[PDB]
């Protein structure tokens, strides 16, 4: 698995099992589940008020207000319509499904529920993609603190939109490995010239953010994706969004998998060494 | 563990070291007269359970008679298995029961280390006669069970034990 | 002529008078004695008493007694009682490991070098029926690694980790008398320091006296072999080896030295009394991945027959656990360039 | 290379000279046996420390003693990625030091990895082969570090394109 | 006990350090019999060490049961444990090298590995607080006894310290004491270095 | 837990207790291009007993300075003109030289090669066992 | 406890249970298997785990965990990659982790696990809990006085373990194994079905067995009596089962009978299926407790807990308790008849969360304040070293 998936399997699997038993006419099992998603996201699935014929899927993001300030609410409404309801205390968005009132095909709703995290993020990208399109320049930049110590900056220009991630590498050696990856991203166009351009600043933030309270530290790193109209237009938007919003996790997911691999190499090398070292015995 | 006989009395007669227990049966034999529960009954009851066991602790000489009947039931099943009518197998049984199966002391009898040998020609005669009587009654009663009230139908619920061997022994091996 | 008694080291060895049996310690608190049967070796005895590894074993020929010393700091003299060896404890009065031991020629006393930086000269008092001992301390500054007695049973040569080969006097008047004047000196009271090498290098792994004991040689860790001549004002002749350190050394004549060590094979050194110069004429082991009999360092080497005067056969045990028997004349024929003395 | 074989050759020769040990009980503690180069509590038992340097970065320290030798290596680390790969690799092995018997749990200050070869080792194993192992080891860690370096770059390019190709 | 001990030990006036599988004593003995008034006790011996090893081996990843596996651990202690001489020095060996690691086959076949806990367990004898005990430890305890005694008879006691008891068979123990005693005499009796003349041996 | 902070072993009466070449002469030989002589000149009166590091280091540099001044194919010839005592001292200086790399290692390794062929591994063992060394 | 629940992963030899702390059931119960191509580029990442890796065509299925212990680290490590980033979708740097280990796992293995969790995934905290202890904790769900001293009977598909626990620590020297478990039962039920039924596709002989075993099997009090009922009123005991032929899709159907009770029976009468082993499971448990210290023996009898799939069988505990009492009672008899020792209180607790007792106890313990207290942190790992993961303080009582 190279790219990270977008949907949330626990959401989708949970819902499905309930929807099945529902159709089968069985008596509803109570359900109470707590789980997370990448970047401090916490979910909750439960029977509101204990009514086991209702299933609520709530999501909580510490930086919701930020996305709310960029179309979040409006977008979520379009996508979920009547499933979207008053948010459960402690969470920002709640979906409610009446087990006795499901569509003919449950795949649309199940798939869409599994994309709650992603849809909460979608609006901020659409809003600025739409700015570029209308040539509305000079618009203030969106600042999303998706993590406690990580920030995403979105901005639109004459013919391009920029996404800048301020990521952190806890492990001092992860910075070094990250550098190898970022290097390959900067040259990523030598194999796809139409693809987005990628920039990387070891850790002085890009100049557009020097007067800002932007972070500056040995373990900090700024990535800039230059998305072009061919990526931000109503034809690419969704897919582009599905990738871009999973980047930071993609990068870190691969720094760890590399270390895992270096490990298998070290197991093999150490194993050999031990053999040579032991053929040194008179048997 | 395994199921043991409870027919052993203080005044029970011995043929060898096997207990000469009573038996409701028409066939003739040195079998005493009998309670509507004979040793052949007790064996047919416990079979399906007992059969699985590989170890069996001899408690009374009555057990030895129980073990014998049991081993024989397996022989019958090996027969009733390839039959097409209670009438037919009912015959193959009378016959089988008449065959000269080995006895304690002879090579061919499994368990010669648990079954005493007839101390003389008289006992040899009685024992042979008893074992045979036992085989015949046993084979007959077994036929009612083995066949479903729908003839030509050896109940697979009896046939399925054909390959099982109580204490991993055989009167035919 | 190699034989493997095991794959672990033979810490030390000792042979009886008839060279019929050999005592060995296989990295153990024990001492196994093997005897020959046809052309096979058979273990006949097992001496278990040391609570530490045996680091030295010497067999007194005439009295046929075995003496052993271990890291447990003890030393038991073993006596043969019909079909068994019985150990007798001998308080060395030391607090570190015993490193080596050797009976004296007259078999009336034995010495034990140790990490207590002293040499324990032991003897028996038939009076109170037991083994006593006096210490030769000064000027020893470190662990004594090897000992060898002078033929007169009084003078004693010692090599220690303080880079010195010294000759003392283990004169114990309670068992012998006024030693006869030696070129090594007239005055020989107990522990008197008769001679001392001058180099301040290489631990003296092994020392050896000549047949008449007027010459003493020793091998050090600096990969050099020396021989001090008492008929030449104790002048010392040195030969720096081009190879690894020697651990053991013995005279095979009055001017021929045979040694082995970490290179894993025996070599020949010859002394030119005239020029007072040592020379290398060695390498007798002429043909794991080694072209030598022993597959690990050779740590001990004793004379098997012919004395140090005109040795005919000599033995070598080593860290590989092997025991080799070398025939001097045999060697002289396999190598035409050979020159004993 | 041009200078590699010569470097190793010098190192091998010094190892051949250093691995000449014997069992030596302690002069300081009753019934104790310790690797002198480690406890260093009896200076006449220690040999002169020596170094074989290939250049100002790659060098080997060889500390001998009557019953043990400590060998510390300075591994070639050209850039950041090699520096961290090497560091992770040595750590990996040190953490398994009990399986190695000649490996030191920690490096001697100033070095990347270290060996502690005792007389027990040279008795259990052919010393001429222990000498081979150390040279084999030096040559092989450099290869592994390069192999890892390539692996990482190899995957980074595929990871970058797999993500850029989808926009 | 120490009476007969130091006594027909062929010496009749020294000090007996007696530690068995349960309790330690320091028995002074003057020309003839002993002087009870000085004799002190240490509530730390055999079992305690074995006890302590168990705890140490637990932290290593070996969960032995205090009751069930006590004898097993006692055997281990007897075989692998010892007294470190220079604790600072020993801890370094345990942390930087693996020369102290030894294997031990348990009664059921499994093979555990014991290293640094070999000298840590018996270290209790010198640092009681390690096993939650109040005291100064066998060495310091001894030193105080002799010092707190007839100065004339002191020199004699020191040159006549005898060891007795299982928990005194620990390799290095003698050396450790001597070093410890030489540290207390150097501090609590002098301060200046004129030790060459401060002779005393434990045999 | 205070009395143990002192290393009594320091004062235990049982503890073990154990000018330079002529610069101008060397420089004179160097400047004239007579290398094989500068070697012999430097391998002279080594500060084997000096208690100062500066003094020894002084000599070490003088010798290293000559070694470096050599040309690849000119070493073997030089080394073969020395007696074993000479080759031993040489080897001792080569190891000293390994502690100051500089631009010297590449060439000092060529010296080790040649020295090893002449003096054998024994010349190295004697570097290790030296108590008084340059 | 922050706002994010800890990650709880229980790696069984056959199944791996995973989810977040506090949840009552695991969020994923998947096969402990990984499929790989059988390296350069990103070939190491080209794999699948759990169900998705059982039928993979161009892929080879592997099983990292054998007899509870990790046999292949390279593979166990990759397995975790997906467990974390594909299923749990958890940012490993943000969640503490609780993993489990079979009894008799070596201290080295823990360091190997810790090396992976800290050096590869960068977890903030880690805790390695021993399965048996978790099981004891899970039974508190039944008992109003929580205790971590008891006897655990773990049985899955490999071998069954009788593991005594005292004050939170497994009494290693007293564990005992039994050559009977899920497998031996299937292979047995498989033979019962072969001698009798037809229609079962050879290539689905075991498929059928394991199925029947799990859907109908149970423990009965008396064999003859049970056999009787079946032969008497075969209508109220002979169940039907229908499986679809892989080929032709011919929906075959068989009759299930005796095996319903003869399966779980081999536990108590091993000799039925196994020639080399005959001890009844109630005897082994008795033998075990008898070896543990006297002062702990009764508490062990009073708290025998279950864990494993093969402990699912209806009445398992009931039959085990009867059997055990008969043995322990009869022993106290020969003493009164030889000289009257207080009667021993033998108990066998069975609860609802048994299907995943271990993962359940782990889930409950990992959501308590104390869990964070007795957990090893990344800072301690980096400063003190992986040695700290050798020992994991017991907590919870
Ligand atoms: N070689 C040894 N090293 C350390 N301790 C030992 C050794 N041998 C025995 N012990 C311990 O010494 C104690 C037994 O001493 P002993 O005097 O026999 O007991 P007690 O005097 O109380 O009857 C036990 O703790 C035993 O484990
Ligand atoms: N309800 C059940 N009754 C009896 N056995 C079951 C039941 N459910 C599962 N099993 C058996 O549990 C065993 C589990 O074996 P294993 O693969 O090791 O899983 P785990 O690692 O969780 O113990 C299998 O034999 C499975 O058939
Ligand atoms: Ca499990």
JSON list of C-alpha atoms and ligand atoms in Angstrom, two decimals, chain G residues 10-17 29 32 63 65-66 68 131 154-159 181-186 210-211 213-218 264 267 307-314 355-356, ligand 2:
[
{"chain": "G", "resi": 10, "resn": "UNK", "atom": "CA", "xyz": [-3.57, -8.50, 20.59]},
{"chain": "G", "resi": 11, "resn": "UNK", "atom": "CA", "xyz": [-1.60, -10.74, 18.23]},
{"chain": "G", "resi": 12, "resn": "UNK", "atom": "CA", "xyz": [-2.84, -14.30, 18.45]},
{"chain": "G", "resi": 13, "resn": "UNK", "atom": "CA", "xyz": [-1.29, -17.14, 16.46]},
{"chain": "G", "resi": 14, "resn": "UNK", "atom": "CA", "xyz": [-4.36, -17.34, 14.26]},
{"chain": "G", "resi": 15, "resn": "UNK", "atom": "CA", "xyz": [-6.13, -14.04, 14.79]},
{"chain": "G", "resi": 16, "resn": "UNK", "atom": "CA", "xyz": [-5.10, -10.50, 15.60]},
{"chain": "G", "resi": 17, "resn": "UNK", "atom": "CA", "xyz": [-7.59, -8.38, 17.52]},
{"chain": "G", "resi": 29, "resn": "UNK", "atom": "CA", "xyz": [-10.54, -9.18, 14.31]},
{"chain": "G", "resi": 32, "resn": "UNK", "atom": "CA", "xyz": [-2.64, -13.13, 11.71]},
{"chain": "G", "resi": 63, "resn": "UNK", "atom": "CA", "xyz": [2.15, -16.67, 9.23]},
{"chain": "G", "resi": 65, "resn": "UNK", "atom": "CA", "xyz": [3.29, -15.86, 14.64]},
{"chain": "G", "resi": 66, "resn": "UNK", "atom": "CA", "xyz": [3.80, -19.51, 15.56]},
{"chain": "G", "resi": 68, "resn": "UNK", "atom": "CA", "xyz": [2.14, -17.39, 20.17]},
{"chain": "G", "resi": 131, "resn": "UNK", "atom": "CA", "xyz": [-2.11, -12.43, 27.85]},
{"chain": "G", "resi": 154, "resn": "UNK", "atom": "CA", "xyz": [-6.00, -20.81, 27.34]},
{"chain": "G", "resi": 155, "resn": "UNK", "atom": "CA", "xyz": [-7.07, -22.80, 24.31]},
{"chain": "G", "resi": 156, "resn": "UNK", "atom": "CA", "xyz": [-6.99, -21.79, 20.67]},
{"chain": "G", "resi": 157, "resn": "UNK", "atom": "CA", "xyz": [-6.12, -23.92, 17.65]},
{"chain": "G", "resi": 158, "resn": "UNK", "atom": "CA", "xyz": [-2.60, -24.96, 18.51]},
{"chain": "G", "resi": 159, "resn": "UNK", "atom": "CA", "xyz": [-2.03, -26.26, 21.99]},
{"chain": "G", "resi": 181, "resn": "UNK", "atom": "CA", "xyz": [-7.10, -27.88, 21.03]},
{"chain": "G", "resi": 182, "resn": "UNK", "atom": "CA", "xyz": [-9.19, -26.44, 18.20]},
{"chain": "G", "resi": 183, "resn": "UNK", "atom": "CA", "xyz": [-7.20, -28.37, 15.60]},
{"chain": "G", "resi": 184, "resn": "UNK", "atom": "CA", "xyz": [-7.31, -31.80, 17.26]},
{"chain": "G", "resi": 185, "resn": "UNK", "atom": "CA", "xyz": [-11.05, -31.25, 17.61]},
{"chain": "G", "resi": 186, "resn": "UNK", "atom": "CA", "xyz": [-11.56, -30.34, 13.96]},
{"chain": "G", "resi": 210, "resn": "UNK", "atom": "CA", "xyz": [-14.39, -26.54, 11.72]},
{"chain": "G", "resi": 211, "resn": "UNK", "atom": "CA", "xyz": [-17.80, -25.16, 10.66]},
{"chain": "G", "resi": 213, "resn": "UNK", "atom": "CA", "xyz": [-17.63, -27.69, 15.34]},
{"chain": "G", "resi": 214, "resn": "UNK", "atom": "CA", "xyz": [-18.30, -23.98, 15.84]},
{"chain": "G", "resi": 215, "resn": "UNK", "atom": "CA", "xyz": [-22.00, -23.87, 14.94]},
{"chain": "G", "resi": 216, "resn": "UNK", "atom": "CA", "xyz": [-23.26, -26.96, 16.80]},
{"chain": "G", "resi": 217, "resn": "UNK", "atom": "CA", "xyz": [-20.69, -28.59, 19.11]},
{"chain": "G", "resi": 218, "resn": "UNK", "atom": "CA", "xyz": [-20.99, -28.50, 22.90]},
{"chain": "G", "resi": 264, "resn": "UNK", "atom": "CA", "xyz": [-15.31, -31.02, 22.91]},
{"chain": "G", "resi": 267, "resn": "UNK", "atom": "CA", "xyz": [-10.64, -32.49, 26.09]},
{"chain": "G", "resi": 307, "resn": "UNK", "atom": "CA", "xyz": [-9.68, -17.67, 27.37]},
{"chain": "G", "resi": 308, "resn": "UNK", "atom": "CA", "xyz": [-9.49, -18.88, 23.81]},
{"chain": "G", "resi": 309, "resn": "UNK", "atom": "CA", "xyz": [-11.82, -20.03, 21.08]},
{"chain": "G", "resi": 310, "resn": "UNK", "atom": "CA", "xyz": [-11.73, -23.62, 22.27]},
{"chain": "G", "resi": 311, "resn": "UNK", "atom": "CA", "xyz": [-13.15, -22.50, 25.61]},
{"chain": "G", "resi": 312, "resn": "UNK", "atom": "CA", "xyz": [-16.27, -21.26, 23.83]},
{"chain": "G", "resi": 313, "resn": "UNK", "atom": "CA", "xyz": [-18.04, -24.64, 23.94]},
{"chain": "G", "resi": 314, "resn": "UNK", "atom": "CA", "xyz": [-21.27, -24.58, 25.94]},
{"chain": "G", "resi": 355, "resn": "UNK", "atom": "CA", "xyz": [-14.41, -14.70, 22.58]},
{"chain": "G", "resi": 356, "resn": "UNK", "atom": "CA", "xyz": [-11.71, -12.04, 23.03]},
{"chain": "H", "resi": 2, "resn": "LIG", "atom": "N1", "xyz": [-17.52, -20.91, 19.21]},
{"chain": "H", "resi": 2, "resn": "LIG", "atom": "C1", "xyz": [-16.47, -21.72, 19.14]},
{"chain": "H", "resi": 2, "resn": "LIG", "atom": "N2", "xyz": [-16.52, -22.99, 19.72]},
{"chain": "H", "resi": 2, "resn": "LIG", "atom": "C2", "xyz": [-15.41, -23.83, 19.64]},
{"chain": "H", "resi": 2, "resn": "LIG", "atom": "N3", "xyz": [-14.32, -23.44, 19.01]},
{"chain": "H", "resi": 2, "resn": "LIG", "atom": "C3", "xyz": [-14.23, -22.22, 18.44]},
{"chain": "H", "resi": 2, "resn": "LIG", "atom": "C4", "xyz": [-15.30, -21.33, 18.48]},
{"chain": "H", "resi": 2, "resn": "LIG", "atom": "N4", "xyz": [-14.92, -20.23, 17.84]},
{"chain": "H", "resi": 2, "resn": "LIG", "atom": "C5", "xyz": [-13.68, -20.41, 17.41]},
{"chain": "H", "resi": 2, "resn": "LIG", "atom": "N5", "xyz": [-13.25, -21.62, 17.77]},
{"chain": "H", "resi": 2, "resn": "LIG", "atom": "C6", "xyz": [-11.91, -22.19, 17.55]},
{"chain": "H", "resi": 2, "resn": "LIG", "atom": "O1", "xyz": [-10.93, -21.41, 18.26]},
{"chain": "H", "resi": 2, "resn": "LIG", "atom": "C7", "xyz": [-9.66, -21.84, 17.74]},
{"chain": "H", "resi": 2, "resn": "LIG", "atom": "C8", "xyz": [-8.75, -20.61, 17.65]},
{"chain": "H", "resi": 2, "resn": "LIG", "atom": "O2", "xyz": [-7.43, -20.94, 17.23]},
{"chain": "H", "resi": 2, "resn": "LIG", "atom": "P1", "xyz": [-6.40, -19.75, 16.86]},
{"chain": "H", "resi": 2, "resn": "LIG", "atom": "O3", "xyz": [-6.32, -19.63, 15.38]},
{"chain": "H", "resi": 2, "resn": "LIG", "atom": "O4", "xyz": [-5.15, -19.91, 17.62]},
{"chain": "H", "resi": 2, "resn": "LIG", "atom": "O5", "xyz": [-7.19, -18.45, 17.38]},
{"chain": "H", "resi": 2, "resn": "LIG", "atom": "P2", "xyz": [-6.71, -17.65, 18.70]},
{"chain": "H", "resi": 2, "resn": "LIG", "atom": "O6", "xyz": [-5.19, -17.22, 18.42]},
{"chain": "H", "resi": 2, "resn": "LIG", "atom": "O7", "xyz": [-7.58, -16.49, 19.02]},
{"chain": "H", "resi": 2, "resn": "LIG", "atom": "O8", "xyz": [-6.68, -18.72, 19.90]},
{"chain": "H", "resi": 2, "resn": "LIG", "atom": "C9", "xyz": [-9.94, -22.47, 16.37]},
{"chain": "H", "resi": 2, "resn": "LIG", "atom": "O9", "xyz": [-9.84, -23.89, 16.46]},
{"chain": "H", "resi": 2, "resn": "LIG", "atom": "C10", "xyz": [-11.40, -22.07, 16.11]},
{"chain": "H", "resi": 2, "resn": "LIG", "atom": "O10", "xyz": [-12.03, -23.06, 15.30]}
]
